[PDB]
Amino acid sequence: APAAVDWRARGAVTAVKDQGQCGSCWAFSAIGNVECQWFLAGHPLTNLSEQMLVSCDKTDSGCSGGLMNNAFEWIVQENNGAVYTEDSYPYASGEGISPPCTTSGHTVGATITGHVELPQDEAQIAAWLAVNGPVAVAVDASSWMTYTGGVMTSCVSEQLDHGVLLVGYNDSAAVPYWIIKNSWTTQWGEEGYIRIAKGSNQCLVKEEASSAVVG
Ligand SMILES: *[C@H](CC(=O)N1C(=O)C=C(OC)[C@@H]1Cc1c[nH]c2ccccc12)[C@H](CCc1ccccc1)NC(=O)[C@H](CC(C)C)NC(=O)[C@H](CC(C)C)NC(=O)[C@H](C(C)C)N(C)C
Numbered sequence: 544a545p546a547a548v549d550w551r552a553r554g555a556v557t558a559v560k561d562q563g564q565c566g567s568c569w570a571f572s573a574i575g576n577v578e579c580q581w582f583l584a585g586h587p588l589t590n591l592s593e594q595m596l597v598s599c600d601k602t603d604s605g606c607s608g609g610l611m612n613n614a615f616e617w618i619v620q621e622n623n624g625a626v627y628t629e630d631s632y633p634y635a636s637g638e639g640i641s642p643p644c645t646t647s648g649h650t651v652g653a654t655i656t657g658h659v660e661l662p663q664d665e666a667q668i669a670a671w672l673a674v675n676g677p678v679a680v681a682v683d684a685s686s687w688m689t690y691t692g693g694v695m696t697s698c699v700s701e702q703l704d705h706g707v708l709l710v711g712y713n714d715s716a717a718v719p720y721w722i723i724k725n726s727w728t729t730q731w732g733e734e735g736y737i738r739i740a741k742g743s744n745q746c747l748v749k750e751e752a753s754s755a756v757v758g
Contacts, residue, residue, distance in 0.1 A: 544666070544669050544670040544673050544714075545673050546713070546714050546715045547711070547712065547713040547714065547715055548669075548672060548673050548711045548712055549710065549711035549713075549722060550579065550672075550676060550677055550710045550711055551710055551711070551722075554582075554588065555579050555582050555583060555588070555676065555677070555710075556578075556579060556677070556710055556724065557575070557578050557588060557590055558729075559724060559725070559726070559728065559729045559734065559735030559736070560593070560634070560726050560728075561637065561726065561727065561728045562593075562636075562637075562726040562727065563634075563636065563637025563638060563639070564637065564638055564639040565597070565605075565606040565636040565637065565638075565639045565640075565641065566606050566607055566608050567593060567596075567597045567605070567606060567609075567636055567641075568608075568705050568706040568707070568726060569596075569603060569608060569609035569610055569611050569613075569614060569706040570593040570596035570597050570600075570603075570609065570614060571593055571706065571707075571708075571726035572611050572679045572680070572681075572706035572707050572708050572726075573596060573611040573614040573615060573618075573679055573706070573755070574591050574592065574593045574595075574596065574626070575677065575679065575708040575724060575726075576611070576677055576678065576679040576708060576753075576754050576755055577591055577618075577626050577653055577655060577755045577757075578590065578591050578653070579676050579677040579708075579710075580655070580675075580676055580677075580754065580755050580756070580757045581652075581653040581655075581757055583675070583676045583757075584757040584758050586653070589628060589652045589653060590628065590629040590630065590652075591626050591627065591628060591629055591652045591653055592626065592627040592628060592629045592631070592632035592633070592634075592649070592652070593629075593634055594629075594632050594633060594634045594635055594636065594641075594642075595622075595626065595627050595632050595649075596609070596614050596617070596618075597634075597636050597641045598636075598641050598642055598643060598644045598645065599617075599622075599644040599645075600613070600614055600617040600618075600621075601617075602614075602616065602617050603617070605636075605641040606636055606639055606640070606641050609706075610681075610706075611679040611681070611706055611751075611753060612658065612660065612751075612753055615655065615657075615658035615753070615755050616658075618655055618755070619655060619656065619657060619658075624654045624655050624656055625651045625653075625654055626651070626652055626653045626654070626655065627649040627650060627651060627652060628649070628650045628651075628652035629652075630650070631649040631650040632645070632649045653757070654757070655755040655756060655757055656756050656757065656758065657755075657756045658753055658754060658755045658756055659753060659754055659756060660752070660753045661678065661752040661753055661754070662752075663749050663750060663752075664749060665741060665742060665744065665748070665749050668680075668709070668749060668752050669712050669714070669741075671754075672709060672711075672712070675754065676754070677708050677709055677710045677724075677754075678708070678709040678752050678753070678754050679706065679707075679708055679709075679752070679753055679754060679755075680706070680707060680708070680709055680723075680748055680749075680751065680752045680753075681703040681704075681705065681706055681707075681747070681750060681751035681752075682698075682703065682704075682705050682706075682707055682723075682739075682746040682747060682748055683698065683699055683700050683701055683702050683703055683704055683705070683746045683747050684704060684705035684707075684746065685699045685701070685702075685704070686698050686699040686746075687705070687725075687732075687737065687746075690731075690732050690737060691732065692732065692733050693738065694716075694718045694720045694738045694739065694740055695737065695738065695739045695740065695745065695746075696718065696739075696740045696743075696745070698739055698740075698745040698746040699746070700744060700745060700746050700747050701747075702747075703747055703750060703751060707723050707724060707725055707726070707737075708723065708724040709721055709722070709723055709724075709748075709752075710722050710723070710724050710736075712741055713741075714741070718740055719740065719741040719742055720738040720739060720740055720741050721738065721739050721740075721741050721745075721748060722736060722738055723736060723737045723738070723739060724736055725737055
């Protein structure tokens with residue numbers, strides 16, 4: 544695996560979003576992953592709809608939480624692999640109330656065929672990411688509140704409660720790290736990103752890693 548990867552530098556990552564006062568993290572992570580996979584399968588960078596998942600995926604629980612893997616399953620088994628554009632299906636749960644699933648039509652922005660669950664192993668996730676792109680992961684984000692910058696090295700790592708997107712890593716640094724996209728605006732952390740130390744399962748980063756499959 545390479546020493547360092549940042550998918551943002553290939554132009555593969557969309558702007559940092561704002562989930563607002565809704566517990567839709569799982570959807571931002573899932574959709575983040577799909578946006579990057581669609582881009583890397585050859586299509587142009589498209590912003591996709593989280594609201595689709597929050598309002599329409601009934602295996603998950605909207606503003607009350609969910610799981611990226613359930614979202615990937617819902618997309619494939621209940622929605623024929625289709626993911627709508629953000630433009631046609633925009634986010635409306637910023638105040639913490641999800642609207643009902645829409646009964647209009649929307650523009651399809653991407654299509655997925657499945658997802659893979661990655662091993663529970665930081666090095667193998669890194670290798671898979673170098674080859675195939677950004678990975679949806681669950682983390683314990685209890686200690687993320689106070690984070691302003693740097694590489695977090697004492698992340699409380701007791702219970703998975705948050706979903707985010709790995710976009711890179713650096714194995715060469717003094718303190719190796721993952722580069723993680725969050726959904727709490729660009730005013731949080733490092734322009735909306737966080738670096739956590741790599742190699743010591745910080746925030747339980749390795750426990751629940753996965754990705755949609757395009758094509
Ligand atoms: C997304 C995370 C989130 O929005 N967060 C935070 O983690 C921290 C935040 O702000 C500080 C925001 C809002 C927030 C969450 N807790 C608090 C407390 C106080 C202030 C602000 C906040 C959501 C959050 C769900 C939620 C919503 C309202 C209140 C509490 C929690 N997290 C998830 O959806 C999470 C993501 C997984 C780990 C990828 N999913 C779960 O926790 C589910 C919960 C079910 C679906 C209700 N649990 C599991 O998936 C779990 C495992 C991993 C299989 N189960 C099945 C045991």
